[PDB]
């Protein structure tokens, strides 16, 4: 009941308790478009003393894999650094990052381990990975148990369910990049406009063939 052992009926209570820990985080989402994929994190810069642009929740794992996280921010940073060095290991060994699915699977195995053993709590963090590989655009989710699922569009955070409802209704598969980031912002709006404000969010995109591009402060307000 108080460490990763099984329930009276088939539940891992600590891994549940980690999922409600990642429900308490900041919302973020991502979606594929016609020839790439985008990630938009809400960034709700609370005080004016925070160095707005220098805090980044969309972090790069490689020039061809990015990640946005939600949950406990410390476990987030540690796990994202593990993903970075694992991508570097595959660059050293095989010469290129052939599959981004292998990269999410190794990180998810790392999370499964601390789901599995005693003497350690699970990673209370959830992530979504985005990028192109040889196969094409991929968008993955990652769960405190280490569960991965592949999406065309997904969410994470406090606005998990509201955003996923909007995506469940209004997502169109093949979509130009401009209308894609517009649909993503409308998703982020409908959920986060319960504090009656959104802000400028942070958003990155790739189209297949090019490297990574994170927007600047000025460009996102045009779509806002």
């Amino acid at each position: 009941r108080a460490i990763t052992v099984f329930s009276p009926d088939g539940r891992l209570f600590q891994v549940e308790y980690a999922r409600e820990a990642v429900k308490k985080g900041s919302t973020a989402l991502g979606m594929k478009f016609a020839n790439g994929v985008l990630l938009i994190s809400d960034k709700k810069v609370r005080s004016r003393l925070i160095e707005q642009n220098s805090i980044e929740a969309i972090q790069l794992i490689d020039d061809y894999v990015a990640a946005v996280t939600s949950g406990l921010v410390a476990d987030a940073r540690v796990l994202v650094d593990f993903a970075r060095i694992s991508a570097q290991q595959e660059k050293v060994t095989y010469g290129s990052l052939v599959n981004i699915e292998n990269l999410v699977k190794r990180v998810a195995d790392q999370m499964q381990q601390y789901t599995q053993y005693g003497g350690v709590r699970p990673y209370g963090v959830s992530l979504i990975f985005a990028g192109i590989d040889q196969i094409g655009p991929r968008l993955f989710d990652c769960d405190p148990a280490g569960t991965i699922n592949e999406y065309k569009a997904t969410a994470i955070g406090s606005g998990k369910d509201a955003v996923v409802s909007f995506l469940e209704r209004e997502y169109k598969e093949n979509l130009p990049e401009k209308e894609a980031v517009t649909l993503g912002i409308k998703a982020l709006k409908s959920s986060l406009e319960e504090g009656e404000e959104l802000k400028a969010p942070e958003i990155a995109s790739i189209t297949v063939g090019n490297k990574y591009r994170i927007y600047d402060q000025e460009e996102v307000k045009k779509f806002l």
């Binding site: 060994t93 095989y94 010469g95 292998n102 040889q134």
Partner: protein, 203 residues
């Protein structure tokens, strides 16, 4: 021993002799030095026998595990990089071998790897004891505008020159052409004897 690998237009032809010695004393008149390493790429052997067969077992295993985990074949640059890292993680208890791995992914390739793990591309390559002879004839006759039949004729003429002018090589030549359309196909010995009797190399 001798190996040969040729990249041409949309294909790669790799052939070896089959004579293993293992002593001075040629001992096995029919060995096996041409290995299919994956459904679109193969590997040839020109070194110490035991170490190289261990290498072939390991690379078959790793590429099959790769194709299973990723549902796609491995690229040729990746398999040569993997093979180079394997040979260079241990070089002070070293493998005395000269590997040559060819194959096609979206363009044909044949890569050469020395005993220290220096992977390098070339449009045709050869390894082994009777290797400078086939480099001579491939320097004199090879053109990149060949078909598959002219290519395999060139390869058989090459290995025939190496069998004529070298002690360590010999035995029945075996050839495998790997192309994207029909995949990896190793020629039967009847067609090989047919090309030998046609090209005027039989004695």
């Amino acid at each position: 021993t001798t190996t040969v690998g040729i990249t041409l237009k949309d294909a790669v032809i790799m052939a070896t002799e089959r004579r293993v010695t293992m002593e001075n004393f040629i001992m096995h008149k029919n060995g096996k030095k041409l290995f299919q390493i994956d459904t679109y790429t193969g590997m040839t052997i020109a070194g110490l026998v035991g170490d190289a067969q261990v290498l072939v077992r390991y690379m078959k295993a790793e590429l099959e595990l790769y194709r299973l985990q990723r549902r796609v074949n491995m690229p040729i640059e990746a398999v040569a990089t993997l093979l180079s890292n394997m040979l260079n993680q241990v070089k002070y208890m070293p493998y005395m071998v000269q590997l040559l791995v060819g194959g096609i992914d979206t363009a044909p390739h044949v890569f050469s790897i020395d005993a220290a793990g220096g992977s390098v591309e070339d449009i045709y390559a050869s390894t082994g004891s009777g290797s400078p002879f086939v480099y001579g004839v491939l320097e004199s006759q090879y053109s990149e505008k060949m078909t598959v039949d002219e290519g395999v004729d060139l390869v058989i003429r090459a290995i025939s020159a190496a069998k004529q002018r070298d002690s360590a090589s010999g035995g029945m030549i075996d050839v495998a052409v790997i192309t994207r359309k029909d995949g990896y196909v190793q020629l039967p010995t009847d067609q090989i004897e047919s090309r030998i009797r046609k090209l005027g190399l039989i004695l």
